[PDB]
Amino acid sequence: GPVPFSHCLPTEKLQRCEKIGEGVFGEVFQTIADHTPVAIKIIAIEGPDLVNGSHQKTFEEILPEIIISKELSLLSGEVCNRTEGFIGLNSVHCVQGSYPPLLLKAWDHYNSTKGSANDRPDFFKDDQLFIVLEFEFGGIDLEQMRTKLSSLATAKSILHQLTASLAVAEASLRFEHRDLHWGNVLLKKTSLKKLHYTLNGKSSTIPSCGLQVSIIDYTLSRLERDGIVVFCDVSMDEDLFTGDGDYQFDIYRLMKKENNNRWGEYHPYSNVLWLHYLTDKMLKQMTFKTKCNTPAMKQIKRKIQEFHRTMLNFSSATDLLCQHSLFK
Ligand SMILES: O=C1NCCOCCNc2ccn3ncc(c3n2)-c2cccc1c2
Ligand code: NA
Predict the structure, then answer these.
(1) Is 71 a pocket residue for ligand 1 (Cβ < 6 Å)?
(2) Domains defined along the chain, listed by start
(3) With CB atoms 3.0 to 4.6 Å apart as the test, which of 33, 74, 179, 306 could cross-link to 220 if both were Cys?
C-alpha cells in the first residue's frame, strides 16, 4: 500500500524543494530529481479533517486527475494527434506521514513572500495519506510573467500554442480543461524557433517567440475514451459559481450556462471561453517590454482584438485553430 514520504522525497530532494504554487487541492513544489527539475503536487486524501476549506478526496476521487494527467502527457509521443503543450507526468505515489518539516519550511517562505490562501499543512498525523504527483518542470506561470513578455507577438504565439494544444486534445480525447486561468499556463524558454504539432494526421508549426507553453492543473478537466467519461462533477458545487472581481469567475458561470450543469457531457465551447478569458488578460493586464509602436506590431494587436471580438462565435479550439483568421 502506501510508502513513507522519504521514499519519494529523500533528504536531498526535500532540501531542494521550493514551493511554487497551491490550490484548494494542496501544494506544489519545485525540486531536483536525478539532476533534473521537477514539480511535485501533493494532495491529502482519505482523512476527515477540513483542508483549505474542503473535505479531502478519497483515492477514487483523485483517479480522474491521474488518468487525465497521464493521457495529456502521452500526447507528446503520439502521431496523429501530437502535442507537447500539456505537461509530462513522471510518477504517481501514495505516501503516508505527517508533513515533512522541510516542506513546512518551504511553505512558510512562500507564505512570507507571496502570501498563501491555504492552511499551513502542519496538522496531518503520521497515518495521513497523500497522493504525490511528479511532473516535468514547465517554467513559470503566465500571471507571474505578466510584466516579463517581449511583445504582442509573444502573446500571439502563446494564444496559438494554447489553441493548438487544446485542439489536439479535443480531437484525440474530447478534452476540456475547465479551469484554464492564467496561473495554469506555464512559459519556458526554448531556442527552437518553430514548435510542431499534429492534428488529425496533419502536421503544422507555430513560431515560438522563444517560448514553449505548458497547460497544467487538470483538477476540473474532462475527457473520454471509447465512450467512458472521466470528469469532475461540480454540479452541486455552490462556491465555484459565485466568485467575482475577475472575468475568471464569470467563465465558471458561462460554462454552467453552456452545459446546463451536466458536466459529463462534452462542450468544447468551454475551451473557447477560457481562451477568450486568456486573450482578455493578454490585452488588459499584461505589460510588454516592447510596446506595439511599429506598424507590424500594431497590426498584430488589431488581429488579437479581432480575435477577442469574434472568438466566442466559434464552437471549439479545433474550430478556432482551423478557421480563425488570427492563425492564417
Ligand atoms: O496543479 C498544478 N499546479 C497548480 C497551479 O500552480 C502552478 C505553479 N507553478 C508551476 C510551475 C512549474 N510547473 N511545472 C509543472 C507544474 C508547475 N507548476 C505543474 C504540473 C501539474 C500540475 C500543476 C503544476
Ligand atoms: Na509542455
Answers:
(1) no
(2) 1-137 (3.30.200.20), 138-328 (1.10.510.10)
(3) 179
Q: Is 233 annotated as a binding residue?
A: no
Query: Pick from 106, 125, 115: which is nearest to 51 by CA?
Result: 125
For 212-224, letters b (16+ CB in 10 Å) and e give bbbbbbbbbbbbe
CB within 8 Å of 50: residues ≥ 6 apart = none
Grid cell listed for 124: 496531518
- Which whole-number Å values give the CA distances from 74 to 24, 194, 327, in the listed order? 26, 21, 25
User: Rounded CA gap, 276 and 280, in Å?
Assistant: 6
Angle between helices 59-74 and 152-173 (to 10 degrees): 110
Q: Which residues contact 123 (CB under 8 A, 6 or more apart)?
A: 49
Report the DSSP beta bridge partners of residue 40: 29, 134
Residues 6+ apart with CB under 8 A from 49: 56, 123, 124
User: Is residue 304 a contact partner of residue 159, using CB atoms and an 8 Å limit?
Assistant: yes
Q: What is the dihedral of CA 106, 107, 111, 115, to 10 degrees?
A: 120
Distance CA 105, CA 82 (A): 39
Region label for 89, one of left (φ > 0), alpha (ψ between -120 and 50) or beta (otherwise): beta
- Look up residue 131 and give its amino acid: I
The ligand that comes nearest to the alpha carbon of residue 190 is: 2
Q: What is the rounded radius of gyration, in angstroms, for the C-alpha atoms of the chain? A: 20
To the nearest 10°, report the CA torsion of 286, 191, 133, 100.
-80
Residue to substitute in 20, 24, 28 for testing ligand 1 pocket (most ligand atoms within 8 angstroms of CB) = 28
Distances (CA, A) of 208 to 98, 134, 160, 282: 43, 26, 9, 16
